[PDB]
Write a protein that binds this ligand. Structure first.
Ligand SMILES: [Mg+2]
Ligand SMILES: [Mg+2]
Ligand SMILES: [Zn+2]
Lengths: 7, 57, 34, 56, 227, 220, 1112, 170, 94
DNA sequence: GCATCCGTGAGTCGAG
DNA sequence: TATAATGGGAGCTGTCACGGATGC
């Protein structure tokens, strides 16, 4: 889902 | 920026601020074609005024 | 899509010329002839 | 000891005195030896490496 | 599956008797460090050389004393004595004692040492000490053949009561560096390129050092032969 | 030689707060309303948190995450506005010949209003560095000439001078006072900071400025 | 192997069915098992009851409905690209009022999608999931006015698309205002419409002095309910004729009409509880005996005034409270769209009723099912809540079904979404996981249902607790909403118990979320488990209490992305939840009853039960999921094996003996390695590839159509012009590649020829033709080829043709051919690995085994993780996991370490001691003492204060081993690492982000139509976007020619790009750029806006960029 | 959107010199493709350009010598690496490509800070400047090793970090 | 870094002029097939192939090295353009 | 002179 | 190509901050 790629 | 520990030179901010001051508002038109309250570039009004002063207007 | 007026596209640097001593001399003689 | 600041200063001063080519070589050298020594340094993290002080 | 390829070419770059660079490529994957490390270990520890193992100076008790008439202390002289490069001309010779006696204003060099049969001094312009007016230096130095590095307390040799034991730097090899870089031959992309860099004192050249080093290793490989 | 300590001190990884949360304690935590919750988390990450503690920290974690995620867009917008306003500014000439300049203060009124205190080293650096002197400065028996590009050593010198009471302010060429049309000149700009030397004519200064201001934007 | 589990907390109840939120919802909506007369007024039945009867004199009425059996099974629907669905019939009767004639018939309304056993749908062959929505629960709310303090807003909110929000506000001028459809008007008017006398409003609102005076207007009371009604109608409808029946119609439809205005059942309940009243219907008023009667308005006004005055027992509302936010599940959403389509069908019905012949009209002639069908289909296709199911691993599906979204129709948009709604409300406890949410733009908007959480019939999320009476904790479990939970003092689940009694002088509890220390006498309830606080994913992270929440989020999210591995293993350290996940996800196959196994096959397992019956289970084998991950079931039993009930028959994807297997258990050393692990990069051993660790099967599907054209038919054939036999080598007679063949990029999967577009051959072509004397063929090679960067073994071919039995394609299509290609993917450089603690990294290096750090016994490590990733990240769970992992390596055992009831340091130390004895004593008996290198490392560690001076080498090595550290040898040297290194077993997964999928490059390729710029995306063979910011970079560098190339030569300058390509293949430097085509597009698009854009020279003379082509 | 561009996952480059990046073989084969056709014609590898291209069409048709041809093609040349978001000008930097096996781009450690790039799964785009001019700008102005210091603060933007500092300190 | 980049930057009043010079010079080398080079046979930049060291195909590398030798003249308005073109065409045909 | 209306903005690749 | 037929029908409601144009 974005930020540094969790999702 | 300092608060967050970001070292950044005054120059850049100065460039931006310079662009922010880029304009002026006419208080009196004098002998020109301009109007009261007309917004224009400082460079343009200065060039105009140097032409008028050179002309004696 | 024009070349921007900055860096290598600056009017200050973009008309610059490069020539070798051989060709420079030859052209200098081409001038010295006429 | 060499830490982030002293190394940064080293890089800057090296830029000033020796120029960017030599500074680049320096940078790569520092890189190489840094990685090399970091490998065999014995640096690791165990649960006992977070040391709770008795003062707490 | 099928693998057949050519033996590597050994490349040599040498400047004087002091330094050399040695390149071996291509090598199979990993063999760069397989050859490099043992050689580095051998080159540093096992290469035969000479060193100053003991020093006696007139009117000098211990190492940290000073010498009236001389500016350098006993410590500084011993240091210079470590940088002395002595080459034995004959294989039979094990140990020598070199005598030096000088006075008056002078700057003593390594050349000033009284010559001995089959003993060559590689660095005669090496500066041992400076003597002032009234300055008197009378000393004997013990030079032995050995390998690697022995601290003074480990050999602890004394010919007399005032003799000061010196850290013995035997190794003619001052430094060894090696680096492996990935290289490619055709479609083989994992191959190794071995580069060796050897600094010596000139008594034994880098190429001689490497040759002596690889021989020691090969000889050690023969030890797996007869149980 | 403790790994956490070495990594922290060297600048390799970690700050004191994180190391603290690992060893000493997790600390005070935030309610969703933004007010700080009375009872703190007495557990470090080594000892492990209680379910309730974890959940209490969750509010702060979420607040921070949303902060980041929603920060990127506003930062980006700011950058685009800056680029659009500065884009025409380039170094179009060596000198505009202006006699105008600005004076960078080496001192600022104290918070108590009592007196003037020396400005922080980094602040003075960020205002004086790579600048061209608008006027002659004589300090500590050293002559810093008009037209000189102040090096870092020149800056440190001027700071020493200020500490010695010799100079309270430094006259300097600045984009603020530059008369170059559609841009700035070389002397008024000073150093290309990347090259630690005077700026090359043709350098697009506006874009560099906008990017220099914009890039840190998501750290705010 | 032995599974040892820690923790003292005994969970009273198991996890509820995890897919129940989907399953029971949809089942409730359909009521297929309920005989029609026994059906309730909820669901699609509700929609039928709201739509019908249809009047205006013909009357169409609704009797009942029925759902038939699905025409095709789920699998067949997946293959044929069909929708799993049941035919929906509705029994209707037309009744002519005057005639008395009644014509009754059962009409076919089309199909409705059936939910599968696992809670998903099959739409056009693809599996989809309808995600639950979260929104503001309908009811009456009171919120602080942001502008003027002391004043409040009373909002009356119905269900979405159920009619207008109504606001009530006390104006600065003193009069109470009502807002409807953005219209502010005095409330007293509507009050008069409801038939309120000034005396009644005075006696009712008199208790509040200042306000009711502002309510009083005599001009309104001087009117009549009729006159007031018409006045209000003129206020809400300017210009619209104020007819009496029309005003009645409008006001009824706005307020009292149950079909137009609907508060939910939940809205009804909440309004009742808040306003302290009783609602008759679900509307705000009624039409009874000819006039209107009030329901909600007066109680709302009363409460509003009471709150404004300061009267006790009146509070504002927290709209983020989970008592005020409810969930719309699959059933409600589908039912909503059903209601809409039904309404449209009704409109059509009234149409036909007016137009059709009066003598004969059947319900069949009146009803066109099409609009309804369209509504349903639209919902299951183009809705934002209808999402492509994530099947990557079973946990992905299970988690997807449990998702909650604040977005979608009737929901938030990311612009309207501020910090408040994205916050973790205290009421999320036990309901919505505080941990698992996306990192980016959707953060807090897309959340996950907690493990023990349940959605009630009203749509509110409920969490279980346990009754505590007199300090005694019962086994009685009570599910409460947040509102109910707020009424109690609830003890933590870890409060010490002896038997069923709490023993502590002081216990930690919550009162309305507030942490409080209370005596056992004060404890009303107690938590079921720490598990209930988090989601199913977060519950899979062992030592969670040791990990910062931010990385727990990442571990959670990343577990979803785990690829099923052929060799897949359950974690060495589990949380205890690993089996329930496999079971609920319907991944594994289980034994129905106690019995004996008759037959075991790769394709089949036949079981004989107590009934004597022979039940045969087919195993799904190498099936392709939505994400292309291979889903296959393998038999875990053998012939003759006795199986009890609920025993494992077969392991599905990512399942090892019934335990969830998301990755491998690898032996890690935590050290820096030569910069190859720099910045989260990871170093692995080639030994992992050798033994096929992190190898996964992926299946890709290719598809081609041969259709009828006007130039002649396309056809699938083996005859392909200008192609050798080398290219047709693997093609069968019909032109389709044969099963078992290996395909690489450029290879033909399916041969196809298409008739050439009409063209007169250029003189070059004609001359070349005559020179080579070969007739120009009238067909060209359109064949489907393996795209760049892809390939594998062809495992399947499907061929459907027009004229074939049971096969009808879309119009014009002669035939369709699919080719399924499987590939076995080894782990490679650039592949993404992660652990459950949020430690993620891309593999940067694969070393041969001899280069790997190794233990003194000659055992090389599998993976090297950089310690620099730990401190700033603050996830220590992975370290503990490693330590325990070390113990279980040498003891050969696996552990269950429940979250927050864990394994603790001392216990791990014990296990590590035993393990050390195993790891060392063996050596001591083998005739080897302590190594020299071990001595040196011991000296080093002794300086670090790791071991105590004076102890023997063995004692010190044990001292280190208890710290989870061991001596490690550099494989490249043989000299030991100077410090002792942390080494142990860690569970690491291979994520769905794989460089093989992401690697793309292009020189030239297809261009866009209008802009003539390169297409985007790998699949289209597209170019990378050089955007405004990249342009800014080039500008900042002052690189003008690089930039100008980006803008012209490399993108939309036609002449430029052509001439550039030719120049480069020739070896000439690239020609000067020209006008980018999109500028011409800009000029012509501005001309279409009637603006003249002129390119001029310095002479101010026009310049033609269209080169005369645009000028007459 | 532009031609002669690509993208892939990034991987740490520790053996790389500051001015270099690892570039996957196939990416390079595609990005430099016309040059490669030309160089294939300059040698006996193909009769002509079209023959060379038809040869590069199928993956099984290509041989050993084409890779050496590609090696000669890229010699001295640089490619532009870029990572989004590009916040300042150092979001794009120029590197000499070194052909590597595998599908990942290799990035130099010292430039990571400037790209805000790390090894957790970041991707980067490659672009090939075509003209002598573009190439000259890329090598003189945009070369990684030619920008050491921050255009913003004037302080070094390429500096020891993480493991490097760790070892040197140690 | 490019060899002797600091000296190269030292040669010009603006770095972008160095770029313009190098680029134009390289195009000159390409057009005339490196026949106009000011580099002596042993100063020729080499590329290492499978067979042996050959001429570096890269005209920019060349141009920079040539610039370093000092044998190149750069500036504005040295010669009329087509005159330079035609004279180089005479001395070094293509 | 000041409330309130309307219009218009609100990050980049990637894939879909 | 002829009975007569005579004013429609959904809204979509949780951002925000600004700037500039009308209204007390
Ligand atoms: Mg190798
Ligand atoms: Mg990253
Ligand atoms: Zn100026």
């Amino acid at each position: 889902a974005x930020x540094x790629x969790x999702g | 920026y300092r608060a967050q520990g970001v070292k950044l030179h005054d120059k850049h901010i100065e460039i931006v601020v310079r662009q922010m001051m880029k304009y002026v508002e006419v208080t009196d038109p004098g002998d020109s074609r301009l109007l009261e309250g007309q917004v224009l570039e400082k460079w343009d009004v200065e060039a105009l005024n140097e032409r008028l002063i050179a002309e004696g207007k | 899509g024009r070349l921007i007026p900055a860096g290598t596209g600056s009017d200050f640097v973009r008309f610059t010329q490069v020539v070798d001593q051989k060709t420079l001399k030859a052209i200098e003689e081409a001038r010295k002839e006429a | 000891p060499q830490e982030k600041n002293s190394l940064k200063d080293l890089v800057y001063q090296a830029f000033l005195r020796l120029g960017m080519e030599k500074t680049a070589r320096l940078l790569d050298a520092l890189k190489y030896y840094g990685f090399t020594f970091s490998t065999t340094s014995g640096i690791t993290i165990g649960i006992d490496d977070a040391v709770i002080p008795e003062e707490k | 599956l099928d693998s057949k390829l050519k033996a590597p070419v050994f490349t040599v770059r040498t400047q004087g008797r002091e330094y050399g660079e040695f390149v071996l490529e291509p090598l199979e994957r990993g063999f760069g460090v397989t050859l490099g490390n043992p050689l580095r270990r051998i080159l540093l520890s096992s290469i035969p050389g000479t060193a100053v193992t003991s020093v006696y100076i007139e009117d000098v008790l211990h190492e940290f004393s000073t010498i009236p008439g001389v500016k350098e202390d006993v410590v500084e002289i011993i240091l210079n004595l470590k940088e002395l490069v002595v080459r034995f001309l004959n294989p039979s010779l094990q140990t020598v004692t070199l005598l030096l006696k000088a006075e008056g204003p002078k700057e003593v060099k390594a050349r000033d040492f009284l010559p001995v049969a089959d003993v060559e001094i590689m660095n005669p312009d090496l500066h041992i000490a400076t003597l002032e007016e009234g300055g008197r230096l009378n000393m004997e130095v013990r030079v032995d053949r050995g390998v690697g590095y022995v601290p003074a307390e480990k050999h602890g040799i004394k010919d007399r009561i005032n003799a000061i034991p010196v850290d013995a730097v035997f190794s003619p090899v001052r430094r060894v560096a090696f680096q492996v870089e990935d290289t490619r031959l055709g479609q083989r992309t994992d191959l190794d390129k071995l580069t060796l860099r050897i600094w010596t004192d000139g008594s034994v050249t880098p190429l001689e050092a490497l040759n002596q080093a690889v021989e020691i290793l090969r000889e050690h490989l023969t030890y797996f032969s007869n149980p | 030689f403790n790994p956490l300590y070495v990594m922290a001190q060297s600048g390799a990884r970690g700050n004191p707060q994180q190391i603290r949360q690992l060893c000493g304690l997790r600390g005070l935590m935030q309610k969703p309303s933004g007010e700080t919750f009375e009872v703190p988390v007495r557990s470090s990450f080594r000892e492990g948190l209680t379910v309730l503690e974890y959940f209490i920290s969750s509010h702060g974690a979420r607040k921070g995450g949303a902060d980041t995620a929603l920060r990127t867009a506003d930062s980006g917008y700011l950058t685009r506005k800056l680029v659009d306003v500065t884009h025409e500014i380039v170094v179009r000439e060596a000198d505009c010949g202006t006699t105008n300049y600005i004076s960078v203060p080496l001192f600022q009124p104290d918070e108590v209003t009592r007196s003037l205190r020396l400005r922080k080293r980094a602040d003075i650096e960020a205002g004086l560095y790579g600048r061209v002197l608008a006027r002659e400065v004589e300090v500590l028996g050293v002559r810093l000439e008009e037209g000189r590009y102040l090096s870092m050593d020149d800056v440190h010198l001027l700071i020493k001078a200020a500490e010695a009471g010799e100079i309270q302010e430094v006259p300097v060429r600045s984009p603020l006072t530059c008369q170059t049309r559609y841009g700035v000149c070389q002397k008024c700009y000073g150093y290309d900071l990347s090259m630690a030397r005077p700026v090359s004519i043709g350098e697009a200064v506006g874009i560099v400025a906008a990017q220099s201001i914009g890039e840190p934007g998501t750290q705010l | 192997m032995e599974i040892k589990r820690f923790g003292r907390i005994r969970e009273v109840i198991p996890l509820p069915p995890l897919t129940e939120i989907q399953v029971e919802s949809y089942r409730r909506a359909l009521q297929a098992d309920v005989p029609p007369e026994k059906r309730e007024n909820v669901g699609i039945q509700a929609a039928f009851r709201e739509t019908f009867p249809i009047e205006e004199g013909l009357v169409l009425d609704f009797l009942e409905y029925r759902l038939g059996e699905p025409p095709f099974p789920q699998d067949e629907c997946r293959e044929k690209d069909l929708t799993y669905q049941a035919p929906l019939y509705a029994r209707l009767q037309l009744i002519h009022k005057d005639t008395g004639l009644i014509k009754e018939d059962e009409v076919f309304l089309g199909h409705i999608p059936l939910m599968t056993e696992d809670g998903s749908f099959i739409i056009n062959g693809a599996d989809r999931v309808i995600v639950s929505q979260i929104h503001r629960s309908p009811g009456v709310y009171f919120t602080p006015d942001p502008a003027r303090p002391g004043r409040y807003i009373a909002s009356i909110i119905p269900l979405p698309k159920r009619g207008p929000w109504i606001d009530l506000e006390v104006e600065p001028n003193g009069v109470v205002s009502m807002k409807v459809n953005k219209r502010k008007f005095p409330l007293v008017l509507l009050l008069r419409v409801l038939g309120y006398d000034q005396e009644t409003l005075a006696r009712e609102l008199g208790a509040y002095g200042e306000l009711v005076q502002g309510l009083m207007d005599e001009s309104v009371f001087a009117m009549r309910p009729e006159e007031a009604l018409i006045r209000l109608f003129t206020l809400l409808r300017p210009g619209d004729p104020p007819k009496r029946d029309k005003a009645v119609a409008y006001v009824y439809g706005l307020i009292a009409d149950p079909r137009r205005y609907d508060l939910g059942e939940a809205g009804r309940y909440k309004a009742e509880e808040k306003l302290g009243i009783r609602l008759s219907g679900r509307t705000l008023a009624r039409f009874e005996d000819g006039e209107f009667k009030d329901e909600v308005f007066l109680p709302t006004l009363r409460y509003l005034f009471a709150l404004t005055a300061g009267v006790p027992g009146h509070e504002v509302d927290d709209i983020d409270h989970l008592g005020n936010r409810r969930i719309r599940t699959v059933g409600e959403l589908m039912t909503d769209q059903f209601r809409v389509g039904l309404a449209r069908l009704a409109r059509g019905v009234r149409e036909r009723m007016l137009m059709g012949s009066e003598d004969s009209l059947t319900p069949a002639k009146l009803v066109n099912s099409r609009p309804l069908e369209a509504a349903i289909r639209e919902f299951f296709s183009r809705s934002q809540l209808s999402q492509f199911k994530d099947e990557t691993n079973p946990l992905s599906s299970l988690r997807h079904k449990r998702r909650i979204s604040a977005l979608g129709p009737g929901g938030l948009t990311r612009e309207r979404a501020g910090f408040d709604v994205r916050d973790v409300h205290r009421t999320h406890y036990g309901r919505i996981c505080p941990v698992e949410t996306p990192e980016g733009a959707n953060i807090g908007l897309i959340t996950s249902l907690a493990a023990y959480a349940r959605v009630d019939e009203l749509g509110f999320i409920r969490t279980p607790y346990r009754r505590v009476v007199g300090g005694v904790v019962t086994d009685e479990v009570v599910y409460m909403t947040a509102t109910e939970e707020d009424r109690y003092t609830i003890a933590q689940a870890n409060t010490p118990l002896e038997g069923n009694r709490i023993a502590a002088e002081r216990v930690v509890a919550r009162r309305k979320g507030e942490p409080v220390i209370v005596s056992p006498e004060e404890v009303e309830f107690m938590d079921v488990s720490p598990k209930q606080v988090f989601s199913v994913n977060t519950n899979l992270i062992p030592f969670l209490e040791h990990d910062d929440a931010n990385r727990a989020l990442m571990g959670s999210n990343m577990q979803t992305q785990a690829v099923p591995l052929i060799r897949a293993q359950a974690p060495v350290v589990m949380t205890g939840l690993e089996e329930r996940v496999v079971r609920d996800s319907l991944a594994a196959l289980y034994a129905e009853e106690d019995g004996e196994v008759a037959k075991v096959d790769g394709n089949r397992i036949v079981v004989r039960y107590e009934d004597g019956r022979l039940v045969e289970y087919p195993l799904r084998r190498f099936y392709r999921s939505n994400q292309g991950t291979a889903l296959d079931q393998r038999p875990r039993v053998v012939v003759g094996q006795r199986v009890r009930k609920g025993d494992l028959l077969a392991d599905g994807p990512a399942s090892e003996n019934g335990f969830l297997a998301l990755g491998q258990n690898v032996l890690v050393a935590i050290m820096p390695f030569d910069g190859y692990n720099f910045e989260d990069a990871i170093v692995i051993s080639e030994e992992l590839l050798k033994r096929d660790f992190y190898t996964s099967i992926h299946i890709e599907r290719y598809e081609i159509e041969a259709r009828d054209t006007k130039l002649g038919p396309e056809r699938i054939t083996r005859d392909i012009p200008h192609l050798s036999e080398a290219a047709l080598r693997d093609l069968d007679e019909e032109g389709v590649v044969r099963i078992g063949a290996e395909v690489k990029p450029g290879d033909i999967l399916v041969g196809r020829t298409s008739f050439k577009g009409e063209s007169e051959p250029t003189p070059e072509e004609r001359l070349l033709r005559s020179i080579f004397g070969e007739k120009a063929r009238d067909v060209k090679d359109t064949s489907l080829r393996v795209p760049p960067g892809e390939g594998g073994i062809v495992v399947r071919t499907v061929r459907l043709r027009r004229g074939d039995p049971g096969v009808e394609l879309k119009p014009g299509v002669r035939e369709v051919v699919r080719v399924y290609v499987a590939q076995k993917r080894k782990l490679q450089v650039g592949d993404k690995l992660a652990n459950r603690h949020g430690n993620k990294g891309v593999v940067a290096k694969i070393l041969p085994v001899e280069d790997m750090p190794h233990l003194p016994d000659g055992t090389p490590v599998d993976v090297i993780l950089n310690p620099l990733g730990v401190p700033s990240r603050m996830n220590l769970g992975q370290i503990l996991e490693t330590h325990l992992g070390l113990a279980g390596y040498f003891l050969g055992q696996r552990y269950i370490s429940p979250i927050f009831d864990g394994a603790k340091e001392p216990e791990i130390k014990e296990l590590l001691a035993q393990a050390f004895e195993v790891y060392f004593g063996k050596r001591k008996g083998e005739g080897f003492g302590v190594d020299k290198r071990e001595v040196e490392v011991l000296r080093r560690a002794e300086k670090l204060g790791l071991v105590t001076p004076g102890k023997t080498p063995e004692e010190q090595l044990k001292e280190l081993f208890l710290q989870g550290k061991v001596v490690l040898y550099d494989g490249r040297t043989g000299e030991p690492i100077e410090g002792p290194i942390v080494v142990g077993q860690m569970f690491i997964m291979k994520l769905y982000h794989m460089v093989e999928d992401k690697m793309h490059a292009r020189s030239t390729g297809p261009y866009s139509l209008i802009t003539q710029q390169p297409l985007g995306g790998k699949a289209q063979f597209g170019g990378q976007r050089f955007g405004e910011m990249e342009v800014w970079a080039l500008e900042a560098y002052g690189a003008a020619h690089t930039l100008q190339e980006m803008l012209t030569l490399k993108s939309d300058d036609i002449e430029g790009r052509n001439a550039a390509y030719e120049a480069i293949i020739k070896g000439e430097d690239v020609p000067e750029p020209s006008v980018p085509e999109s500028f011409r597009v800009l000029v012509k698009e501005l001309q279409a806006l009637a603006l003249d854009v002129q390119t001029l020279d310095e002479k101010d003379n026009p310049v033609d960029i269209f080169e005369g082509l645009a000028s007459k | 959107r532009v031609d002669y561009s690509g993208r892939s996952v990034i991987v740490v480059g520790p053996q790389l010199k500051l001015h270099q990046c690892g570039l996957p073989k196939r990416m390079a084969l595609e990005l430099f493709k016309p040059f490669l056709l030309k160089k294939m014609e300059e040698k006996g590898i193909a009769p002509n350009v079209k023959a060379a291209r038809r040869m590069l069409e199928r993956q099984r048709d290509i041989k050993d010598e084409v890779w050496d041809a590609l090696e000669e093609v890229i010699h001295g040349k640089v490619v532009l690496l870029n990572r989004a978001p590009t916040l300042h000008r150092l979001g794009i930097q120029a590197f000499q490509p070194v052909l590597v096996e595998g599908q990942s781009i290799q990035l130099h450690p010292l430039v990571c800070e400037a790209f805000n790039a790390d090894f957790d799964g970041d991707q980067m785009a490659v672009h090939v400047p075509l003209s002598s001019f573009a190439q000259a700008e890329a090598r003189i102005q945009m070369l990684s090793a030619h920008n050491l210091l921050s255009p913003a603060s004037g302080e070094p933007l390429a500096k020891p970090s993480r493991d490097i500092i760790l070892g040197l300190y140690y | 870094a490019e060899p002797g980049i600091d000296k190269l930057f030292g040669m010009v009043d603006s770095k972008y002029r160095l770029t313009v010079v190098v680029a134009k010079r390289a195009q000159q080398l390409l057009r005339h097939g490196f026949k106009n080079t000011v580099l002596e046979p042993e100063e020729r930049p080499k590329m290492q192939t499978l067979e042996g060291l050959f001429d570096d195909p890269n005209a920019v590398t060349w141009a920079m090295k040539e610039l370093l030798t000092g044998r190149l003249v750069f500036g504005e308005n040295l010669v009329p353009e087509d005159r330079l073109q035609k004279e180089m065409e005479r001395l070094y045909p293509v």
